[PDB]
Design a protein around this ligand. Structure first.
Ligand code: CA
Ligand code: CA
Ligand code: CA
Ligand code: CA
Ligand code: CA
Ligand code: CA
Lengths: 66, 63, 278, 63, 74
């Protein structure tokens, strides 16, 4: 029947649309993870510089009470 | 062909299952790292406080 | 080069069948015995794995006369996605029948409207590259400071079938080797019944930056058998004596410290991989 | 079954859609926390630099 | 009548469903690779966050020591 093949085809196309939604969702996920990654890199840079400054300050304070 | 169609359906189904496993592991990892970011940010606030107080005292000791 | 083949081609729209004509070949090489060849032609359709038809064997001739015709029960609409393959072979009684030369004609380029008949120079066919075994993707992360090597087994695809009547029961075993000695044996979980397994399992090793160029990591994808020793599907190895994409990924890991690098790798037979390890 | 394969695959697909949606929202929260952590980090290295300068002053003065 | 056209419509919808399945396979494959890259990046950023936390702890220790020094000077 044309009704059966067309409804079958309909379920198929619906499955394709759902899969497209999942696809866009996964790619979006990858994108966000990348962005978060670079921002995390920035955070790490700030943290390392902070480690340096703190370390210097600690050496200075420790040497000042000597 | 109907055979190629159904076979494609099967392959797609399996790959989808793989995507499920990936999604779950991903989710757990994201949660753990969220908790991690929370802890790190708390430590960040504590260290912010310590640096501000120590710097305030330091500048006050000038003279 | 080194040969010509006269072929005919026509489609019977009434019976919906393909008419392939094998008339005569010319300018054939002097194999096997000195003088003239013993030729016979195997003709078949692609991608059909159907029974390959073959013409009569002709005793001692470089200019053979077949004058035979073959019929292929093929729908016309499906014919556009097919390709006619004609392969000329040399008959050998006590040896493997060496292929003289084959060529292929795309059926979506053939005008079945008029009776087709053409001479075509035989082409030296391509040779299958061993057998497909499969690919495996994983990530490599190395931190020289702590000497920690993070190898995260990600996944695999197109793995060869082992188990009879079934697909596979794939699992990944990691061998950390040096000087032909197996030092560390780490293995992943078993994903039952799959040709596209997913793991995402992280592993870590102690690798000093002084020996980073003297260590070899052998990844082996095997199939789990319920009873008996589990047969190995394939394996690849990186590090020392590494080649191609392996040395590429290794060098990428070295050039990118404190960072994981994901990459695919084509599996090779266990024999050759074990052989490449000096 | 023929229709059954479609229904099954569809079900798996929708499931992964739900799970991945949740994971995406979790990555959004992660993103907020990462932003806040970024600002806090920059401010922290700023304050650490200033405290380093102050420590330099007090050291040069008191030692 | 429209019998022939009906049959050709059936084959047309069949082919449409077939190519649909093809598109499905391509899409799920691209989604798959996207997810893999996602996981890898999450590993990188994760270890990075671990290192950031360790750094924060070291900062806390050092700053506590400096705090002790300032309490000594006080
Ligand atoms: Ca011969
Ligand atoms: Ca011969
Ligand atoms: Ca087996
Ligand atoms: Ca097995
Ligand atoms: Ca982590
Ligand atoms: Ca930790």
């Amino acid at each position: 029947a044309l009704s059966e093949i067309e409804t079958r085809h309909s379920e198929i196309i619906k499955l394709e649309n759902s899969i497209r939604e999942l696809h866009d969702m996964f790619m979006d996920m990858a994108m966000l993870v990348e962005s978060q990654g670079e921002m995390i890199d920035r955070i790490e840079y700030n943290v390392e510089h902070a480690v340096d400054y703190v370390e210097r300050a600690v050496s200075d304070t420790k040497k000042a009470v000597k | 062909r109907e055979n190629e169609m159904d076979e494609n359906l099967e392959q797609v189904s399996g790959i989808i299952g793989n995507l499920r496993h990936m999604a779950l592991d991903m989710g757990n990892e994201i949660d753990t790292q969220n908790r991690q970011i929370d802890r790190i940010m708390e430590k960040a606030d504590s260290n912010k406080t310590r640096i501000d107080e120590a710097n305030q005292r330091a500048t006050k000791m000038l003279g | 080069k080194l040969g010509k083949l006269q072929y005919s081609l026509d489609y019977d729209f009434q019976n919906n069948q393909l008419l392939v004509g094998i008339i005569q070949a010319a300018e054939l090489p002097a194999l096997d015995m000195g003088g003239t060849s013993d030729p016979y032609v195997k003709v078949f359709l692609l991608p059909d794995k159907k029974k390959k038809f073959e013409t009569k064997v002709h005793r001692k001739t470089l200019n053979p006369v077949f004058n035979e015709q073959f019929t292929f029960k093929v729908p016309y609409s499906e014919l556009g996605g097919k390709t006619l393959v004609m392969a000329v072979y040399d008959f050998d009684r006590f040896s493997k029948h060496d292929i003289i030369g084959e060529f292929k004609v795309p059926m979506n380029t053939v005008d079945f409207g008029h009776v087709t008949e053409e001479w075509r120079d035989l082409q030296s066919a391509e040779k299958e590259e061993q057998e497909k075994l499969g690919d495996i993707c994983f990530s490599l992360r190395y931190v020289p400071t702590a000497g920690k090597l993070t190898v995260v087994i990600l996944e695999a695809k197109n793995l060869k079938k082992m188990d009879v009547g079934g697909l596979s029961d794939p699992y990944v075993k990691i061998h950390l080797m040096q000087n032909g000695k197996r030092l560390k044996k780490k293995k992943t979980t078993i994903k039952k019944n799959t040709l596209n397994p997913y793991y995402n399992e992280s592993f870590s090793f102690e690798v000093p930056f002084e020996q980073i160029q003297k260590v070899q990591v052998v990844v082996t994808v095997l199939d789990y058998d319920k009873i008996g020793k589990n047969d190995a599907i394939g394996k690849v190895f990186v590090g020392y004596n590494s080649t191609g994409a392996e040395l590429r990924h290794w060098s990428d890991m070295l050039a990118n410290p404190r960072r994981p690098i994901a990459q695919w790798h084509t599996l090779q037979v266990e024999e050759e991989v074990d052989a490449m390890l000096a | 079954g023929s229709n059954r394969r479609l229904q099954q695959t569809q079900a798996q697909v929708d499931e992964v859609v739900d799970i991945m949606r949740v994971n995406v929202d979790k990555v959004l929260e992660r993103d907020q926390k990462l932003s806040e952590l970024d600002d806090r980090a920059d401010a922290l290295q700023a304050g650490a630099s200033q405290f380093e300068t102050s420590a330099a002053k007090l050291k040069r003065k008191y030692w | 009548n429209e019998l022939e056209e009906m049959q050709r419509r059936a084959d047309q919808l069949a082919d449409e469903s077939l190519e649909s399945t093809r598109r499905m396979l391509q899409l799920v494959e691209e989604s798959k690779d996207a997810g893999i890259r996602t996981l890898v990046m999450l590993d990188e950023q994760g270890e990075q966050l671990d290192r950031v936390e360790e750094g924060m702890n070291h900062i806390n220790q050092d700053m506590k020591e400096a705090e002790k020094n300032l309490k000594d000077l006080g």
